[PDB]
Amino acid sequence: AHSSX
Amino acid sequence: AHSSX
Amino acid sequence: GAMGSMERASLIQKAKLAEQAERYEDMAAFMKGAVEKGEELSCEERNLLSVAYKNVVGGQRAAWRVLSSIEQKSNEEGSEEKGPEVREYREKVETELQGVCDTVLGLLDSHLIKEAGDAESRVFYLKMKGDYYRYLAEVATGDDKKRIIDSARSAYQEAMDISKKEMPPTNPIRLGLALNFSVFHYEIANSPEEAISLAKTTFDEAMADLHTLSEDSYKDSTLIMQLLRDNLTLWT
Amino acid sequence: GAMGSMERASLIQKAKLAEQAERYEDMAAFMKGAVEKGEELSCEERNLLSVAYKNVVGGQRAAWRVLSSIEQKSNEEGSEEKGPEVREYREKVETELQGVCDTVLGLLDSHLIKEAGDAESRVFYLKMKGDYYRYLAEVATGDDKKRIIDSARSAYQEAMDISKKEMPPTNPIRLGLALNFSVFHYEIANSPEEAISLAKTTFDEAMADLHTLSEDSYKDSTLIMQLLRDNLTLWT
Ligand SMILES: [Ca+2]
Ligand SMILES: [Ca+2]
Ligand SMILES: [Ca+2]
Ligand SMILES: [Ca+2]
Ligand SMILES: [Cl-]
Ligand SMILES: [Cl-]
Questions:
Q1: In chain B, positions 1-5, which contact chain D (CB-CB < 8 Å)?
Q2: Which of D30, D84, D87, D217 has the greatest CB tally within 10 Å of its CB?
Q3: Which residues, chain by chain, have CB under 5 Å from ion ligand 5?
Q4: Which residues carry this modification: Phosphoserine (chains C, D)?
Q5: Rg, Å, chain B Cα set
Q6: DSSP-assigned letter for residue C210
């Protein structure tokens, strides 16, 4: 899954 | 310029 | 600390140079030094701190995952025993990763969070606290794994409560917080349905608020909304 | 050293894990520890040593170039003075780069080169010696810049003399040596015509020897020949 920057 | 690995 | 003799402004300037040079360990050390000056951080400075440690721990997490995979294969049926080296080196990387997480959490606790009164700063730091407990949770296996998980959840939840009361649904901090809390639910808390519900509700409420934004703010918000969409596509 | 208590074989095993994890500073430290066991290195071990430090110094060189460019702009006409920070941080990176180069050259001198009797090992180490003096030369500005340049030239020249007597013109070590010596001529010694002549003669003599090779050896040699061709296209 993609998390924030 | 390209050098070796 | 080794940065105690350097001016705050010089540390910030050098953090920006280190980013341009992709020297993220340097960047982190400079920003740690800036935090330890004891003054609150501006919005730009908070993001420098976050970017620096995100990149440092990101490299550690990637390496830990490589090594953990190799370790797990070595413990399958039919695998030749190659000694303690894989475990040892995985533990070495894991300990360094935990040390970075402990450093960030120590900065947040001494004393960034307690002096953060504005919603934008308090939510930012509480999100960071949830993130670095989440990274600890990714590698945790012992008696305190459940407490580590609950520390991440608690930090994310306080940030969510503030952000919902004090920030519009398109605010990029609020969006990135919800994104990461949803990842926590999916990957850490074994709650994929909660992960999916949070990502969809976050996306939909931001969609309905985009009409209030400038072109520049619209670009900032949709960037994170696309990550929510990417995760939902992965998860459904 | 910190690796003195670890088995040689364990250091080599961990160097290979660190490579898979893209942990090149770890990889370098492991291989430094292996060298300091005092035994000669096999072909595979030599290449692990080379890959590790090449990646460490490669990141340092890239950062130094970013910072040096910023520094040079800050010293143009009309540039606002921003204080000593750019120079300071460039010097910090430069000093760390020089320390890595000194470490490699120290390993080669104590005692890899003197115990290297086979052409494949001796040429390999002398090429490395030329490479790391070349990296020192890239950042040198003082009284010993000329001696640093001549130390690179001398090491490359001894490696060339051996390789021409003892190795076929398609040997990948010989080819990579000639490639790097040609780069030295172009970028360090202000001798572009020598750089071009060496690259063309190296390429042409390897071309004429390819018919002797297996498919696998052919692939190894042509890979480096293409880098010679790329440089000639850049330089002509
Ligand atoms: Ca001051
Ligand atoms: Ca369901
Ligand atoms: Ca032993
Ligand atoms: Ca000419
Ligand atoms: Cl280890
Ligand atoms: Cl500095």
A1: 1-5
A2: D30
A3: C 88-89, 92
A4: 10, 79
A5: 5
A6: G
